[PDB]
Amino acid sequence: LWVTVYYGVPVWREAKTTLFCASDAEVHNVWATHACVPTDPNPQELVLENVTENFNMWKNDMVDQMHEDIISLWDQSLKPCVKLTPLCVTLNCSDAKVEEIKNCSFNATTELRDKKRREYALFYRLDIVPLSNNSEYRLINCNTSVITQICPKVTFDPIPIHYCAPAGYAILKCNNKTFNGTGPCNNVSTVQCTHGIKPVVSTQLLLNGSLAEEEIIIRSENLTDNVKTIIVHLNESVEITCTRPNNMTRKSVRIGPGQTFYALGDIIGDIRQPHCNISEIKWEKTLQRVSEKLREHFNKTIIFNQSSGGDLEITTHSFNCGGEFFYCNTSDLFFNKTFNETNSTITLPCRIKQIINMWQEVGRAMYAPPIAGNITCKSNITGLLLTRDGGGTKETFRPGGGNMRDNWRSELYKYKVVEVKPLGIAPTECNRT
């Protein structure tokens, strides 16, 4: 009968805001710079009851606040160490005698810019480009981009970061198990900040991600599209094992006054390939279970096929392992198989690059220093990245990444940030007497 107000009513509104880091509590690190708030030892999640809120996955904002600050993080970390500007000259490379690795010998300047020692290093064939053959090479992209090297003390090992909304905001979180990526889900719980998100970098097969619950989820945006990718979440973790058995020996060389970097010296013993491993019976059943969950959304037979080709960042399985950047073939005994109706091991050949152009842009090109001794990393494949062919009979799926934001859109497929509006207005009997 009269207007009254109410402080603290459950009313929210979708908005866009600025989140922050929270690590789980001492060498420097590019992801968590040891400047993050400590997390809650027991996070308080408030389960809501009998409410259906619809939210989009692809129209999120946290996946754009995650691709920006990671770029700023590598920009902040690769600043105070040495750029390899005076490195690339007319190199004189033949081969190693231990075609994959070339023995380059060039003229670097010593600590004072009046003498020139000829110094030798070892580079990969995927890292130098010729000029004429006649064996005169140069570094791969010191014509479009200035090239810096990684400061050798820092690491790249992804420790999980939590994204906390500011005080006065809320982060919804869907708790439904079989949640298709866009729509209303009816088991919603608020949380101040999300679970541990490892900022993993891969482009073909997702690594170290959280598994699904009790089903195989096929997340997409338009399933009648050709350029829109298909994220295939998983609930059966398939273990991958990637290693290189060569014992590399790093070597310090000085190029400028106070400016040095590290390059590969000689290789110990017989040279062997860097390869990855996938158990065959843990992979054939995984492709079959994905194939049945894809047949019902197209009502025709599906057949996997090879990647497209071209540059070696699209037709490969690029990932990071222990401080080294791999580029594996991933299209030999995985993606030439159809589906009708022994403890073997699939070995993938894999090649290593030193100079990498991450996030496929120009103006930024980091250089990875070599790592002494062998490395071996065992991981979990929870997630794929498929793409329709463009036909329209049967179906053909090129395994190929669309972007790197889709690599974050698997750990952020169930979160939306909202702003509470705790002022309510209702009519009642009382008046201010």
Partner: protein, 124 residues
């Protein structure tokens, strides 16, 4: 610490009826880096969201009263449902659709109807 935890705590029973959110709250209340700039940008916004609703409360003669009861007549061009129809057959999120286009004309009306209380009875 208790600057946004209460804001998250307001969201208990966000799907219940409007006549139960004043009742079923006591049943649940029983028990320079990059991030150095992100945290500063977050803390200024966390302060500003609290001060905006504090000034909006402070203009209406109640600055800490939860169920603040004001002397403004209910204009029935904003809503036409009775008290028993609204308070027992609606959730609090659904009310913001019906009231969602008469917000500012209620806010300024509440401000001037509180200003009249200071002018009239106290001294002048």
């Amino acid at each position: 610490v208790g600057l946004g935890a209460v804001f998250l705590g307001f969201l208990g029973a966000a799907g219940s009826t409007m006549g139960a959110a004043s009742n079923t709250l006591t049943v649940q209340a029983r028990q320079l880096g990059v991030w150095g700039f992100k945290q500063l940008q977050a803390r200024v916004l966390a302060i500003e969201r609290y001060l905006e609703v504090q000034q909006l409360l402070g203009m209406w003669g109640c600055s800490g009263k939860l169920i603040c009861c004001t002397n403004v007549p209910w204009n029935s061009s904003w809503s036409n449902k009775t008290y028993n129809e609204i308070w027992d057959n609606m959730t609090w999120m659904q009310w913001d659709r019906e009231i969602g286009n008469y917000t500012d004309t209620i806010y300024k009306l509440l401000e001037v109807s509180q200003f009249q209380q200071e002018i009239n009875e106290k001294d002048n």
